[PDB]
Amino acid sequence: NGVLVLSLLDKIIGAVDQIQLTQAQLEERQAEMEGAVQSIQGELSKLGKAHATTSNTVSKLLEKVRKVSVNVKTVRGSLERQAGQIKKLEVNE
Template sequence: MEAQKKLEIVGVEDEAGNPISALTILSLLERVAGIIDNVQACQQRMEERQQELEGSIKSIQGDVLKLAKDHGETSGTVDKLLQKTRKVSANVKEVRSRVEKQNTRVKKVETTQDELLTRNKFRVVIYQVRRIDDVYSEPS
């Protein structure tokens, strides 16, 4: 009993009013130390994970910046292509207009030619007949 009294801490009692032994306190302190060690280990893992996340975020930020730069360059290229397309479209419209005008002129010329041929048909026939007669009338 006396050994047990030596282990009891004077002035420290449990809820029932019984004195608490030094072994109980030592056991509790060891548990608390284990919990603190566990918390510190978890905290260290969280810090390492946070550093990994920060590295990943920096990498993603770099990729986003590169993507934004590439997007800007692509946007410039697309603008240039659109300008060229507009110019080509304007040129195509101009060429189409010229071709339509030329077609109109060609149709007018064909109509005029048809009228002239109709008027001169008899003469052409006579000319052709004379040529044929000349061929037949040549002495052999």
């Protein structure tokens, strides 16, 4: 039976051997992902500043476009006020 005890001992040894190997692999895999995740937060943190900036720009842009359309109306309003003036004079000769 002493043979059965040793027979059972190196089986237990084998198990723990593998469990140690696999758990190494887990420690590694996990370290790796904590790394991935920390990259991602950094980059997500950056893209957020980026967008806030783009956002801020578009608002400027929206205001410039508003100014422009007002000028087109002035210039047009100014324009056929002249057309009226040009009509007045091609009427008197």
